Nucleic acid binder design. Structure first.
Ligand SMILES: [K+]
Ligand SMILES: [K+]
Ligand SMILES: [K+]
Ligand SMILES: [K+]
Ligand SMILES: [K+]
Ligand SMILES: [K+]
Ligand SMILES: [K+]
Ligand SMILES: [K+]
Ligand SMILES: [K+]
Ligand SMILES: [K+]
Ligand SMILES: [Mg+2]
Ligand SMILES: [Mg+2]
Ligand SMILES: [Mg+2]
Length: 1326
RNA sequence: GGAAAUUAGGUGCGCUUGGCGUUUUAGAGCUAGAAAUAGCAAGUUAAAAUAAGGCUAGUCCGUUAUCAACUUGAAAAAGUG
DNA sequence: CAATCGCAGCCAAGCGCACCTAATTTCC
DNA sequence: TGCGATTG
C-alpha cells in the first residue's frame, strides 16, 4: 500500500483525502470508543475540517489601550484630589466623598444627595448662576474675587479630565484682535511686490470671511469672490489658502518645473519654503512671512468664536455663546410653532421616541438626526431664515459636549487652567506652591517610545528606570531612563544582518550604507566608444571621479549627466554608450547632500577620518524622535559645530533601517587582500565583482566567514507573515496530515498535494481627494454605498471620462459600457481596480491579446498622468497602461503569465510546502544528504477548476461542505498524475532542489493528456489514445477507460467526514451596551455593588462552554431534593471561578450532591446524534445547530450547475438539451430536500412554506427555478439556521432554542479528521 | 529558487493620545383636580463607570493565538484504535 | 409552548519596527 | 447569530 494526500487549505476549512495509485479513496474500519452498542465503524478516507475564522489581535489591542487610558485618566483626577486634600478638608470634609458616590441612588448614598454643596438651596443657586461648567470656567478665569475651593476644583478637574489633543507642538497663545490688520498687511506686502497689478482691500471684511463657520476651501472661495480678477489658484489665492492651513501648489504661479507644495503645519515647511525661495528669489520672503502672520490669528477660528480681547477664556466663552444662542433660538422656535403649527408641538417637544427636540435632548436622536427631522418643519414656517442658515452650518441649538470637540488642542484648556491658578493662588497658598504640579497633570503625556510604566509583570513593556520608586507626572524625567527606553524601543524590533546575525543593520540613511548602494550599482556599469572593440568596466579611478564629481554635487545622477559631464568633458569621448543604468542611477548620496546643506563643510564630509563620527550622528538622528534627546546626544560634537548648525542638525530626523550591517559592508576583510567588501566595490582590478559575487566567490574569505557566523510548530506558524485567518488553516493542515499518517500505520505518503485559496469608506475618501487635485467638480455636479458598484467606482476614478478614447461618459448609460482589463484576463487573473478601466466599448483598447495599442497610449497618456498625480490610479496601473510604448507584451511575457497560472508563487504557500517537506523528510544518506521520501506538490486552484469543468465534475458550494473534501481529492489526483506524466515538471511543482513560443504552447496544453480529442487554439484537431503512459518509464499514468469512472465513484460517495471544530468561546464577557434599569433579572451588574434593578447593566453574556450536570436541586417551598440532569452554560466571566473549584461553583448555583466524575465539558459545536441519524450541534447551552449534511446525488449536482448556468462553444447545445430532458430533476431534488428535512431538520412550518413556494413557480424558466432551488439548501445546510428566499417568498430561520433532547442522546467526540470517535450514550447517565 | 538597490501599493505586531455615546444620580418643575388626567413651564450641564475584576500592587495585568475523548503532564506536549 | 420581532459601541490622531506583492537595474 | 422581548 502506497498512498498520497490531497489538501485544500482555506480560511474556514481544510479539505483532505487519501488516494491510492489507482486514484481511489480507501475505506477502513475504525474502532469506536465509549459505552454504546457500536464497537467499530467504516469510514472513507476523505473529508474536511471546518472552523470559525481566526482573528487578528487588533481588536484586543485597541481595548487594551482603552483600559490603560481610563486607568490613567482616573489617576489624573486622583493626583489633583491629593493636592487639594488637606485644604479641602477644612472647607468641606465630605466633598470628595459626595463626588465618588454621585452615581448611587439616594437610598445607597452615605452623604447628602447634592454633591457640590450638600444642601438643596445652595445647589439650586449654583446651576441658576452657572448653567454650564463653562460659565464657571470663564468666571474663574476673568474674576478677581476669591472663589469657593470646591468650585475651583471642579473647574480644574473638568479641564484635566477632558484635556484636549496633543497634535500641535509648542505653545499656543490665541490672539483674535488683528485679523483685519494682518490681512491688510499681507495685501500691502503683495502690492509692493506687484505694483503693476495690485489688489484693492476696499472694505473686504476679512475677519468675518476668514472666521466664519465654513470649511477652509469654502472661506477661500468667499474671500476670492470679493476680489475681482483674482483666481482661487492665483498667487494671492494660494497665499490665502496657505494661511487657512491648506496645501497650495505654487508650481504654476512661478512657472516651475517641479511641485512647490507648502503647508505651515508640517515640520518640512521651513525647508520647503527655502527650496521655493531658492528658485524664485528672496524678495518673496515677506510674502510667505505675512501669510504666516495672518495664519496665527485665524489658526483657532474653528473653536474660538469670541474676540480674545474681552476674555482670557475664549473657549469657554465660545461654549457660552453656544448656550445663549441655543436659549434664544429655542425660545424663538417654541413661540413660532405655538403660532403656526400648534398641533405638532407635543411631538416636537415632548415625544422622546421622535427625532424632535425631545429626542434630541432626552431621546436617542443625534445632532444630525435632529437637523434632518426639523429641517422640513423649519422650511414650512416663516420666518425661520436665520434658523435655516444655522442648520446648514451645523450651528443650530448646539450642545457644548459634541462629537466635533476633538479639534480642541490641550494648550487651550491649559490656558484657562493656568489663568484660574493665577487668579486663585493669591488666596490659596497651596495653589501657588502646586501651580506647576497641577499644570503638569494636564500637559504630561507618556512618550510612545517609553511604553507602559510597568515593573516586571507586563509582556508589552520595555521601559527601564533610573531609580526604583513610583513614577508620577512630575518625577518622570528623573525616575524613567528616557534614553535607554527610547533606545530599547527601536532595538527590540530592528533586524540583525542575516549574513552576520550578531550585528545590527545600519540605518537606511547611513552615509556608509549609501556609499555601498552607489558603488554596488556603479561597479556593473559598462561603457563603449568608437575606438574600443568591446565594452569595459569602470576602473577604480573612474568610479572615484564619477562619485566625486556627480554624486557629491547632485542629489540624483542622470545617465545624460554621466555621458555629458564626465565621459565627454573629462575623458575626451565625443560619444559613448552606457550599459547597466537607465535614465538615472537608482542609488544616491542623499544623506551626504542633507548634511552638506546643514554643516556647510564639504571638506569635513569628505575626510574619511570623520567616518565614525558621521555614522554616530546618523544613528542618533535615526534612533530618536524627540529633538531634545537628539540635541543631548549631539553634545559630544558641539565643538565641531556652531550653535546655528546644531539647531539645524537636531531637526534632521531620519527613519528606516537597511538590510546589512556596517561590519559586513566595511568591516570584515578578505584574508589574502586585506580589503573589505566596500573596498572591492570601490576598486576590484578589472573584474568589478558586486556584492553578490563577492560573498559567493570561493577564492575569497567573505563566503566562509559569513557561513561561520550562521521554535515550536505553533510559534513558527504564528511568526509567519500573512493573515491570521489563513494561518489558522495552516496549523490545522499540519495536524490533519499527522493524523492521516498515523491512520496509514505511520507510513509516509508518496506525495502531498496542497492548494491554497486565493472598503466603502476608503473608496469615498480616495475619490474626494482625487478630484480635488484634479480640480474637477464632478463630485459637486453628481454626488458612499453606491461605490460598491464596480462601474460607478471606475466612473468617478476616471473623472467621468473614457480611458481609451478621451470622451465623456454618460453616468446613466453605465450598462452600455464595458469594464475592460488593462492586461487581458487570459494572461493575468487580476480582478482588482489596478487592472480594470471603464470604456465605451472594449474594442477601443485595440487588439484583444496585448496591452492597449500604441495609438491609444499616445492619445491618452497625458490624461493618465493627471489621474496618477491625483492618486486615482496607482503607479502599477499607469505603467501597464503605457506599456505599449515600451514594446508591449513580449512572447516571453505571455509564457511567463501562463506559467504563473499553474505555478504557485505566494510566499505563504511556499512556507506550508517547506513545513510539510521538513516534517516528512528527516532521514539522511550515507553521504549526509537529505532523503526526499515525500514530494510536496503545490497546485493552483485553476488547475482543478478547469479539470472539473472539462469533465463535468461540477461544484455547487451551497449544497453542502463536501466540495472542500472533493477539491482535496481532485488536487491529489491531478497533481500526482501531472508529476507522473511529466517528471521534468518537478522543479516547478515539487518543493526542494523560439523557446518562448514553445514554452507558451507547452504550458498552455500541459493538461491535454487527460482528453481523447483536443481542439487546439490553432484550430487543428489532435487525438490521444485511451491510456496514457510516461515517456521513459512506460508506467500507466491515466486510463481514460476507467479512471474517470473512479473519480465519479469517489465524488458520489455519500459518507464524507465533515467535522466542525469544537471551540471554547473567548472574548468579551457580554454585549457592551449599558441598558437602563429593568425589573427583569436578565441584566448583569456593571460593578459588584451596582444592583441592575437600580442602575441597569449588561445583557446577553457569552457562554464559554457548557457542562453536563448530574445532581440534585431544591424544589418547592419545602426544598425537596430532586434528581436532575441539566446543561449549564459557563459564561466567559464565570470560567475562572468555575475551573478553580467546580463543585463549589456548582453548589453556589444551587446544585447538591453533584456527580463530579460525570461532569462533561461541552464546548461550542459539540456533536450529538439522536433518532434516525438526526444530529445536533451545540450553539450554546440553550440553542442547537443543525448537525447533518445533505448528500445530494451527483446527477442532481451537475444538473443544478448546468441549469443555473444555462444562460451562460458549439458543445453548449448538448448541455442545454440535457436540462430540458431532465426538467423532472426539479421535483426529485425537492423530494430529496423534503425527505431530508422530515428526517433531520424538523421544521414543518418552513417546509410547508418551501413546498408551497416551489409549486407557485413551476411555470417559471428552468434557469430561475434551479437558481432558487440552490437557495433552498440553506434550510438543510450544516450549522446555524439562516433566512433564505425562494423567488419572492422569504423563509425565516427556524431555530432550535432548546437543548434538553441532547441530554439523553449520543454524544460524539470526533478526532480532527473525524475518523476516530468516542460515543457516549447519555441516556444511561442520571 | 535567492540577494541588494529604486519605485509604487498593502499587511501584521506594539505603544502613546483626542472626542462622543450610554448608564445612575444632582440640576426644587408649576397650576388645577380626590384621583385618572388636563393645561403650561422647562430642556444645552456635571459627577462617577466604561469589560466583573486580579495579585504580582505596577500610573501593571484582564477580549489575539492555541483546545475531541482516554492515559501522562503545571503547561507545552506525548502516548492510545 | 410556538411564531415573530428586535438588537448588537463608535469616531479620530500620532509613532516605531517587521513582513508581503509587483515592476525595473545588477548579481548569486 | 445567539438571545432578549413580544405576541399568539
Ligand atoms: K441614604
Ligand atoms: K473672483
Ligand atoms: K439625544
Ligand atoms: K439619551
Ligand atoms: K453629553
Ligand atoms: K533607473
Ligand atoms: K528618528
Ligand atoms: K480563542
Ligand atoms: K472568536
Ligand atoms: K474535534
Ligand atoms: Mg478599571
Ligand atoms: Mg460625556
Ligand atoms: Mg478617550
Amino acid at each position: 500500500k502506497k498512498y498520497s494526500i490531497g489538501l485544500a487549505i482555506g480560511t474556514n476549512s481544510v479539505g483532505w483525502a487519501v488516494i491510492t495509485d489507482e486514484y481511489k479513496v480507501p475505506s477502513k474500519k475504525f474502532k469506536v470508543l465509549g459505552n454504546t452498542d457500536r464497537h467499530s465503524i467504516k469510514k472513507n478516507l476523505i473529508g474536511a475540517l471546518l472552523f470559525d475564522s481566526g482573528e487578528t489581535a487588533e481588536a484586543t489591542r485597541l481595548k487594551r489601550t482603552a483600559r490603560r487610558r481610563y486607568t490613567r485618566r482616573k489617576n489624573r483626577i486622583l493626583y489633583l484630589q491629593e493636592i487639594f486634600s488637606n485644604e479641602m478638608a477644612k472647607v468641606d470634609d465630605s466633598f470628595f466623598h459626595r463626588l465618588e458616590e454621585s452615581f448611587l441612588v439616594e437610598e445607597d448614598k452615605k452623604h447628602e444627595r447634592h454633591p457640590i454643596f450638600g444642601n438643596i438651596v445652595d445647589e439650586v443657586a449654583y446651576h441658576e448662576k452657572y448653567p454650564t461648567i463653562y460659565h464657571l470656567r470663564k468666571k474663574l478665569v476673568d474674576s478677581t474675587d476669591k472663589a469657593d475651593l470646591r468650585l475651583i476644583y471642579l473647574a480644574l478637574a473638568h479641564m484635566i479630565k477632558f484635556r484636549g489633543h496633543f497634535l500641535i507642538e509648542g505653545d499656543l497663545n490665541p490672539d483674535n484682535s488683528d485679523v483685519d490688520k494682518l490681512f491688510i498687511q499681507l495685501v500691502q506686502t503683495y502690492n509692493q511686490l506687484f505694483e503693476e497689478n495690485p489688489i484693492n482691500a476696499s472694505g473686504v471684511d476679512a475677519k468675518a470671511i476668514l472666521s466664519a463657520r465654513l470649511s477652509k476651501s469654502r472661506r477661500l472661495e468667499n474671500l476670492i469672490a470679493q476680489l475681482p480678477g483674482e483666481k482661487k489658484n492665483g498667487l494671492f489665492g494660494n497665499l490665502i489658502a496657505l494661511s487657512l492651513g491648506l496645501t497650495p501648489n505654487f508650481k504654476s504661479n512661478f512657472d516651475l518645473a517641479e511641485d512647490a507644495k507648502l503647508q505651515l503645519s508640517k515640520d518640512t515647511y521651513d525647508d520647503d519654503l527655502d527650496n521655493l525661495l531658492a528658485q524664485i528669489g528672496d524678495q518673496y520672503a515677506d510674502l510667505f512671512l505675512a501669510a504666516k502672520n495672518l495664519s496665527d490669528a485665524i489658526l483657532l477660528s474653528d473653536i474660538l468664536r469670541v474676540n480674545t480681547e474681552i476674555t482670557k477664556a475664549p473657549l469657554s466663552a465660545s461654549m457660552i455663546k453656544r448656550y445663549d444662542e441655543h436659549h434664544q433660538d429655542l425660545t424663538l422656535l417654541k413661540a413660532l410653532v405655538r403660532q403656526q403649527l400648534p398641533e405638532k408641538y407635543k411631538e416636537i417637544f415632548f415625544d422622546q421616541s421622535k427625532n424632535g427636540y425631545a429626542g434630541y435632548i432626552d431621546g436617542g436622536a443625534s445632532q444630525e438626526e435632529f437637523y434632518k427631522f426639523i429641517k422640513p418643519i423649519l422650511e414650512k414656517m416663516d420666518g425661520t431664515e436665520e434658523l435655516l442658515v444655522k442648520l446648514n452650518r451645523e450651528d443650530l441649538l448646539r450642545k457644548q459636549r459634541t462629537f466635533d470637540n476633538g479639534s480642541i488642542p490641550h494648550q487651550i484648556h491649559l490656558g484657562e487652567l493656568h489663568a484660574i491658578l493665577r487668579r486663585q493662588e493669591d488666596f490659596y497658598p497651596f495653589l501657588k506652591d502646586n501651580r506647576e504640579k497641577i499644570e503638569k497633570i494636564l500637559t504630561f503625556r507618556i512618550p510612545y517610545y517609553v511604553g507602559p510604566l510597568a515593573r516586571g509583570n507586563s509582556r508589552f513593556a520595555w521601559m527601564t528606570r533610573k531609580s526604583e520608586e513610583t513614577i508620577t507626572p512630575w518625577n518622570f524625567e528623573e525616575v524613567v531612563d528616557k534614553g535607554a527606553s527610547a533606545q530599547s524601543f527601536i532595538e527590540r524590533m530592528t533586524n540583525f544582518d542575516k549574513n552576520l546575525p550578531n550585528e545590527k543593520v545600519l540605518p537606511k540613511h547611513s552615509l556608509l550604507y549609501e556609499y555601498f548602494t552607489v558603488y554596488n550599482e556603479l561597479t556593473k556599469v559598462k561603457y563603449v566608444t568608437e575606438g574600443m572593440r568591446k565594452p569595459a568596466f569602470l576602473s577604480g579611478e573612474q568610479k572615484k571621479a564619477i562619485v566625486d564629481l556627480l554624486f557629491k554635487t547632485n542629489r540624483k545622477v542622470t545617465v545624460k549627466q554621466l555621458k555629458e559631464d564626465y565621459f565627454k568633458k573629462i575623458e575626451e569621448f565625443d560619444s559613448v554608450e552606457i550599459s547597466g543604468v537607465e535614465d538615472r542611477f537608482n542609488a544616491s548620496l542623499g544623506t551626504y547632500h542633507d548634511l552638506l546643506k546643514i554643516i556647510k563643510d564639504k571638506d569635513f564630509l569628505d575626510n574619511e577620518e570623520n567616518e565614525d563620527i558621521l555614522e554616530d550622528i546618523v544613528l542618533t538622528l535615526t534612533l530618536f524622535e524627540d529633538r531634545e534627546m537628539i540635541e543631548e546626544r549631539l553634545k559630544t560634537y558641539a565643538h565641531l559645530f556652531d550653535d546655528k548648525v546644531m539647531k539645524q542638525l537636531k531637526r534632521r530626523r531620519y527613519t528606516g533601517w537597511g538590510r546589512l550591517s556596517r561590519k559586513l559592508i566595511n568591516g570584515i576583510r578578505d584574508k589574502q587582500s586585506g580589503k573589505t567588501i566596500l573596498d572591492f566595490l570601490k576598486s576590484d582590478g578589472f573584474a568589478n565583482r558586486n556584492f553578490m559575487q563577492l560573498i559567493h566567490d570561493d577564492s575569497l574569505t567573505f563566503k566562509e566567514d559569513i557561513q561561520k557566523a550562521q521554535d515550536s510548530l505553533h510559534e513558527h506558524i504564528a511568526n509567519l507573515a500573512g493573515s491570521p485567518a489563513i494561518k489558522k488553516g495552516i496549523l490545522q493542515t499540519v495536524k490533519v496530515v499527522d493524523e492521516l499518517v498515523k491512520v496509514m500505520g505511520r507510513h509516509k505518503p508518496e506525495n502531498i498535494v496542497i492548494e491554497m485559496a486565493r472598503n466603502s469608506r476608503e473608496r469615498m475618501k480616495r475619490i474626494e481627494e482625487g478630484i480635488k487635485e484634479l480640480g474637477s467638480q464632478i463630485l459637486k455636479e453628481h454626488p458612499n454605498t453606491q461605490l460598491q458598484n464596480e462601474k460607478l467606482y471606475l466612473y468617478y476614478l476616471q473623472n467621468g471620462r473614457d480611458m481609451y478614447v478621451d470622451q465623456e461618459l454618460d453616468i446613466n448609460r453605465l450598462s452600455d459600457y464595458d469594464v475592460d482589463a488593462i492586461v487581458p484576463q487570459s494572461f493575468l487573473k487580476d480582478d482588482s481596480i489596478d487592472n480594470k478601466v471603464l470604456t465605451r466599448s472594449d474594442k477601443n483598447r485595440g487588439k484583444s491579446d496585448n496591452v492597449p495599442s500604441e495609438e491609444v497610449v499616445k492619445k491618452m497618456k497625458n490624461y493618465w498622468r493627471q489621474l496618477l498625480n491625483a492618486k486615482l490610479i496607482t503607479q502599477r496601473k499607469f505603467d501597464n497602461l503605457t506599456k505599449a510604448e515600451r514594446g508591449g507584451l513580449s512572447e516571453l511575457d505571455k509564457a511567463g503569465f501562463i506559467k504563473r497560472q499553474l505555478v504557485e508563487t505566494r510566499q505563504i504557500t511556499k512556507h506550508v510546502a517547506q513545513i510539510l517537506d521538513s516534517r516528512m523528510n528527516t532521514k539522511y544518506d550515507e553521504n549526509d544528504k537529505l532523503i526526499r521520501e515525500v514530494k510536496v506538490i503545490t497546485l493552483k486552484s485553476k488547475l482543478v477548476s478547469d479539470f472539473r469543468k472539462d469533465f463535468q465534475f461540477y461544484k455547487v458550494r451551497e449544497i453542502n461542505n463536501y466540495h472542500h473534501a472533493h477539491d482535496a481529492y481532485l488536487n491529489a489526483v491531478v497533481g500526482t498524475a501531472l508529476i507522473k506524466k511529466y517528471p521534468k515538471l518537478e522543479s516547478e511543482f515539487v518543493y526542494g532542489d523560439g523557446k518562448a513560443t514553445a514554452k507558451y504552447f507547452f504550458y498552455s496544453n500541459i493538461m491535454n493528456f487527460f482528453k481523447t480529442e483536443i481542439t487546439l487554439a490553432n484550430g487543428e484537431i489532435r487525438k490521444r489514445p485511451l491510456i496514457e503512459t510516461n515517456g521513459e518509464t512506460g508506467e500507466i499514468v491515466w486510463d481514460k477507460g476507467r479512471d474517470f469512472a473512479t473519480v465519479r465513484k469517489v465524488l458520489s460517495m455519500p459518507q464524507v467526514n465533515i467535522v466542525k471544530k469544537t471551540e471554547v468561546q473567548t472574548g468579551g464577557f457580554s454585549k457592551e451596551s449599558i441598558l437602563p434599569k429593568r425589573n427583569s433579572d436578565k441584566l448583569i451588574a456593571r460593578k459588584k455593588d451596582w444592583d441592575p434593578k437600580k442602575y441597569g447593566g449588561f445583557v446577553s453574556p457569552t457562554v464559554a462552554y457548557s457542562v453536563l450536570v448530574v445532581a440534585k436541586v431544591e424544589k418547592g417551598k419545602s426544598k425537596k431534593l430532586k434528581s436532575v440532569k441539566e446543561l449549564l452554560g459557563i459564561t466567559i466571566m464565570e470560567r475562572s471561578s468555575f475551573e478553580k473549584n467546580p463543585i463549589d461553583f456548582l453548589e453556589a448555583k444551587g446544585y447538591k450532591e453533584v456527580k463530579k466524575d460525570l461532569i462533561i465539558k461541552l464546548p461550542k459545536y459539540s456533536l450529538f446524534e439522536l433518532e434516525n441519524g438526526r444530529k445536533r450541534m451545540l450553539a450554546s447551552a440553550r440553542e442547537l445547530q443543525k448537525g447533518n449534511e445533505l448528500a445530494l446525488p451527483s446527477k442532481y449536482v451537475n444538473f443544478l450547475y448546468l441549469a443555473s448556468h444555462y444562460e451562460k462553444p458549439e458543445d453548449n447545445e448538448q448541455k442545454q438539451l440535457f436540462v430540458e430532458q431532465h426538467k423532472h430533476y426539479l421535483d426529485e431534488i425537492i423530494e430529496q430536500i423534503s425527505e431530508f428535512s422530515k428526517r433531520v431538520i424538523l421544521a414543518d412550518a418552513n417546509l410547508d412554506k418551501v413546498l408551497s413556494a416551489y409549486n407557485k413557480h413551476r411555470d417559471k424558466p428552468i434557469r430561475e427555478q434551479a437558481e432558487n432551488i440552490i437557495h433552498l439548501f440553506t434550510l438543510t445546510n450544516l450549522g446555524a439556521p439562516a433566512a433564505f428566499k425562494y423567488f419572492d417568498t422569504t423563509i425565516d430561520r427556524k431555530e432550535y432554542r432548546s437543548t434538553k433532547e441532547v441530554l439523553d442522546a449520543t454524544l460524539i467526540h470526533q478526532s480532527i479528521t473525524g475518523l476516530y470517535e468516542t460515543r457516549i450514550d447519555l441516556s444511561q447517565l442520571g
